[PDB]
């Protein structure tokens, strides 16, 4: 109902204390009894809320759904993000951000429980099941030249990897320049885009797709042997809000790094985190297609590739399969 | 009314022949008498239409207004443009295009008689008076790397200059990289932008502002000594449709050139068309500010600048006053 997010917001915020029906009713100027309906609704979509006589209500656990009212807390505390848009189902978080960034200078992100027209690179499909992943777009506003896009895409990768690492008991490796793996399982695809002209970047738009909670059973057979989810590498079980929280801080940490450090400062960390070395890779370029070894990452974010015919290459980007 | 554009479309198209009330009524399935109302309306907004008994109607001259129905003819005949959007008044053609390009691969342009929030570079104001200029945004879809933006901006300039040249009896010079002059009068500002990522350009968006019909009296005093309009350099008088027609062909010619030639092939033509040589210029860069001579344009579209302290510079872009 109209007041569902507001009740949630107050519950989230009053932790770890209990808030009464009464007090919620005063805050929102509604009846005690409309407050009980709201709370019954929430209990039923899987909010876990302790209700105790004489004391009131305590939100204990959220379900696998994004709620505007909760993420408004994230945006208020945040120095980087002006606001967020939260959706149940949408064509694409990325399409939505590209439309919202027009005509303002705000930094925001967009989340949706499901995408019905999720896209990765080169217009491939990106599977985005309801309840099962974080499907997010982030818009930011760095004052920098349009060349700097590639360097952005390097910092953000270490951020995303760190946030996933904190939750899997197995190793999380980056696959340059746009994917994150646990073993042979791709767990995130991410993608960075921009609007810019000669005078600079107007917005960076970063599309982040992370498998959260899928069982192997839940991926389509075409990708099932090469896909995984954070839940499949977590002992204790995985909360999407706590996850989102860590993800946002990592992004901010990595973003200020991007603003303030040369790529040389994180390069070594990046090599060490990467799973492209000492192994044979498939490169695709508009037609041509070749095997190659990754040799190195140069001071400026180029992959040095020892091609297969022995010719060397310097790539600011590529697309690679194992 | 509902049928105003359709009547116009049929009139434009049936040139140089006369079309009857009758025949227009059959085409659109409306009464002969609703057709006369439509034609009275048009005569009154300044369509000049010859009506002759027994023969019918001939559109002779359009007023200083954009009409969707006429520009739909432009788009149909055109191999480059999928469609156009025409507005009387709008915040910005550029904002509008950035919103329409999202989620499709169409090439189109947008026109508006007046902009209420016209922007040039660095967020400066761009004056866009009703009835007095072509305020257009063009979206295109070249398969090319994001570096190629600057080279695009070089070809399009020679196109815009040529279209204006065809109508002024005085010389039209380009001021690199974003403006067009007749004598000391800036007549167009143009601006090219993109949406892109590492893998290529998703769209080029070109904002073109051209003064058509203003009298010196019509520009604000702040810019009046450094602004001019095509009408002020034309003997015979200036028609915005014929103008738009030439502009579109020039853009297409220059765009295929951009797709198919190195910048070396048009460089000399570009130097010869430019009004930055043999004279003293003011450069602004985020703070710093310096005088300089333009020395040369290198094979790749960089301006070679002999700074004032004698240091040389290689600029892919700049902003310059005389
Ligand atoms: N959930 C998933 N997990 C693992 N692999 C997937 C997957 N969905 C598709 N795949 C496979 O991996 C490929 C991914 O393609 P790329 O490497 O081009 O994908 C790239 C990264 C894509 C970014 C997706 C996020 S979701 C939020 C935002 N809005 C979306 O529209 N885009 C972004 C597919 O072609 C499949 O082979
Ligand atoms: N009509 C005009 N004619 C000449 N000078 C003008 C003018 N309006 C403003 N000026 C002056 O010239 C400057 C132009 O700034 P820049 O050089 O940054 O301007 C640049 C080129 C701007 C592009 C304008 C077109 S209109 C259609 C499309 N949608 C719009 O929102 N943008 C584009 C101003 O700061 C004034 O000094």
Q: Is residue B124 lining ligand 2, measured as CB closer than 6 Å?
A: yes
Q: Where a domain ends, among A48, A63, A78?
A: A63
* Residue B136 alpha carbon, nearest atom of ligand 2: 27
Residues A237, A42: Cα–Cα separation, whole Å: 21
Q: Which residue's structure tokens are 């009857």?
A: B20
Q: Which residue's structure tokens are 């099932």?
A: A224
Determine, for residues B149 and A197 on separate chains, whether the beta-carbon distance falls below 8 Å.
Answer: yes
**Nearest-by-Cβ selection for B196 from A91, A122, A194:** A194
CATH number at residue B241: 3.30.930.10
Q: Are B127 and B59 contained in the same domain?
A: no
Beta-bridge partners for A185: A182
Chain A residues whose CB is inside 8 A of the B149 CB are 146, 196-198
Q: Is B182 left (phi over 0), alpha (psi -120 to 50) or beta?
A: beta
Angle, helices B32-44/B4-14, rounded to nearest 10 degrees: 80
- The torsion angles phi and psi of A5, rounded to 5 degrees, stand at -65, -45
Sign of CA dihedral A275, A277, A280, A285: positive
Q: Which residues constitute the domain of residue A309?
A: 276-322
Of A213, A238, A240, the C-alpha closest to A74 is A240
Classified as helix, coil or strand, A201 is strand
CATH number at residue B26: 1.10.10.10
What residues are in contact with ligand 1 under a 6 Å CB criterion?
A: A 92-94, 115, 118-121, 124, 126-128, 135-137, 178-179, 186, 189-191, 207-209, 211, 223, 227
Residues 6+ apart with CB under 8 A from B75: B81, B82, B83, B84, B108
Classified as helix, coil or strand, B243 is helix
Determine, for residues A195 and B198 on separate chains, whether the beta-carbon distance falls below 8 Å.
Answer: no
Q: Are A82 and A171 contained in the same domain?
A: yes
Chain A residues whose CB is inside 8 A of the B317 CB are 198-199
Of B194, B196, B168, B198, the C-alpha closest to B183 is B168
Q: Residues 34-73, chain B: which have Cβ within 8 Å of A?
A: none
CATH number at residue B298: 2.30.30.100
Residues B9, B107: Cα–Cα separation, whole Å: 22
Of B142, B119, B9, the C-alpha closest to B74 is B9
Q: Are A116 and A261 contained in the same domain?
A: yes
Residues B150, B178: Cα–Cα separation, whole Å: 11
- The torsion angles phi and psi of A220, rounded to 5 degrees, stand at -60, 145
Residues A252, A241: Cα–Cα separation, whole Å: 17
Hey, is the C-beta of B103 within 8 angstroms of any chain A C-beta? yes
- B27 burial via Cβ count (<10 Å: 0-12, 13-18, 19+): middle
Hey, is the C-beta of A221 within 8 angstroms of any chain B C-beta? no
Q: Are B181 and B91 contained in the same domain?
A: yes
Residues A96, A91: Cα–Cα separation, whole Å: 8
Chain B residues whose CB is inside 8 A of the A103 CB are 91-92, 95
**Nearest-by-Cβ selection for A149 from B121, B149, B198:** B198
> Distance, CA B190 to ligand 2 centroid (Å)?
7
Residues 6+ apart with CB under 8 A from A193: A94, A98, A204, A205, A206, A207, B195, B196, B197, B202
Hey, is the C-beta of A122 within 8 angstroms of any chain B C-beta? yes
Q: Where a domain ends, among B63, B79, B97?
A: B63
CA gyration radius for chain B? 22
Q: Are A4 and A45 contained in the same domain?
A: yes
Please, are residues A83 and A75 in contact by the beta-carbon 8 Å criterion? yes
Q: Is residue B246 lining ligand 2, measured as CB closer than 6 Å?
A: no
Residue A206, both tokens: 């970063």
Q: Are B246 and B287 contained in the same domain?
A: no
Q: What is the DSSP string of A82-143?
A: SEEEEEEEES-HHHHHHHHTTT----EEEEEEEESS-B-GGG-B----TTTEEEEEEEE---
Q: Which residue of B has its CA nearest to A177?
A: B198
Closest ligand by atom to B321 CA: 2
CB A69: neighbour CB atoms within 10 A? 18
Q: Are A173 and A246 contained in the same domain?
A: yes
Residues B57, B102: Cα–Cα separation, whole Å: 41
Closest ligand by atom to A186 CA: 1
Residues B46, B7: Cα–Cα separation, whole Å: 15
| Planar angle of CA A241, A259, B313, nearest 5 degrees | 155
Domain count, chain A: 3
Q: Are B121 and B14 contained in the same domain?
A: no
> Distance, CA B187 to ligand 1 centroid (Å)?
47
Resolution (A): 2.5
Residue B307, both tokens: 């700074």
> Distance, CA A174 to ligand 1 centroid (Å)?
15
Determine, for residues B195 and A197 on separate chains, whether the beta-carbon distance falls below 8 Å.
Answer: no
Q: Which residue of A has its CA nearest to B302?
A: A198
Residues A254, A164: Cα–Cα separation, whole Å: 14
Classified as helix, coil or strand, A43 is helix
Q: Are B269 and B280 contained in the same domain?
A: no
Please, are residues B124 and B149 in contact by the beta-carbon 8 Å criterion? no
Q: Are B87 and B107 contained in the same domain?
A: yes
Q: Are B47 and B116 contained in the same domain?
A: no
The secondary structure of residue B43, as a DSSP letter, is H
Using CA atoms, how far residue A236 sits from A132, A167, A185, A272, B127, in Å, is 17, 9, 20, 27, 61
CB B145: neighbour CB atoms within 10 A? 14
Classified as helix, coil or strand, A163 is helix
Hey, is the C-beta of B202 within 8 angstroms of any chain A C-beta? yes
Of A133, A96, A109, A88, the C-alpha closest to A251 is A109
Classified as helix, coil or strand, B56 is strand
Residues A93, A89: Cα–Cα separation, whole Å: 9
Q: What is the DSSP string of B113-138?
A: EEESS-B-GGG-B----TTTEEEEEE
Determine, for residues A146 and B149 on separate chains, whether the beta-carbon distance falls below 8 Å.
Answer: yes
* Residue B118 alpha carbon, nearest atom of ligand 2: 31
Residues B75, A2: Cα–Cα separation, whole Å: 46
Hey, is the C-beta of B146 within 8 angstroms of any chain A C-beta? yes
Q: Are B15 and B102 contained in the same domain?
A: no
Residue B79, both tokens: 């191999």
Please, are residues B108 and B78 in contact by the beta-carbon 8 Å criterion? no
């Amino acid at each position: 109902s109209k007041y569902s997010q507001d009740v949630l917001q107050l519950l989230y915020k009053n932790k770890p204390n209990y808030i009464s029906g009464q007090s919620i009713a005063e805050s929102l100027n509604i009846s005690r009894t409309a407050v009980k309906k709201v709370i019954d609704q929430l209990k039923l979509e899987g909010c876990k809320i302790d209700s105790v006589n004489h004391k009131g209500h305590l939100l204990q656990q959220l379900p696998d759904i994004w709620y505007q009212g909760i993420i408004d807390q994230y945006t208020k505390s945040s120095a980087l993000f002006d606001f967020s848009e939260v959706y149940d189902s949408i064509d694409s978080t990325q399409l939505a951000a590209k439309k919202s960034l027009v005509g303002n200078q705000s930094s925001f992100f967009i989340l949706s429980d499901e995408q019905t027209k999720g896209r990765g690179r080169f217009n491939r499909h990106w599977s985005s099941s309801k309840g099962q992943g974080l499907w997010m777009s982030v818009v930011l506003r760095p004052n920098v030249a349009f060349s700097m896009i590639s360097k952005f895409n390097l910092f953000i990768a270490l951020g995303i990897r760190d946030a996933i690492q904190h939750f899997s008991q197995d190793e999380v490796k980056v696959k340059w320049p746009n994917d994150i793996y646990i073993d042979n399982g791709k767990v995130c695809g991410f993608l960075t885009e921009m609007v810019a002209n000669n005078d600079g970047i107007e917005a960076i738009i970063c599309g982040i797709g992370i498998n959260l909670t899928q069982q192997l059973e839940n991926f389509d057979e075409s990708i099932r042997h090469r896909a995984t989810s954070i839940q499949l590498h977590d002992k204790n079980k995985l909360d999407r809000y706590q996850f989102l929280e860590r993800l946002l801080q990592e992004i901010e940490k990595r973003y200020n790094q991007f603003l303030t450090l040369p790529f040389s400062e994180i390069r070594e960390e990046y090599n060490a985190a990467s799973n492209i070395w000492n192994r044979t890779l498939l490169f695709t370029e508009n037609d041509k297609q070749f095997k190659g070894q990754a040799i190195d990452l140069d001071y400026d974010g180029y992959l040095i590739v020892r091609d297969e015919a022995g010719e060397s290459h310097r790539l600011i980007s590529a697309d690679i399969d194992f």
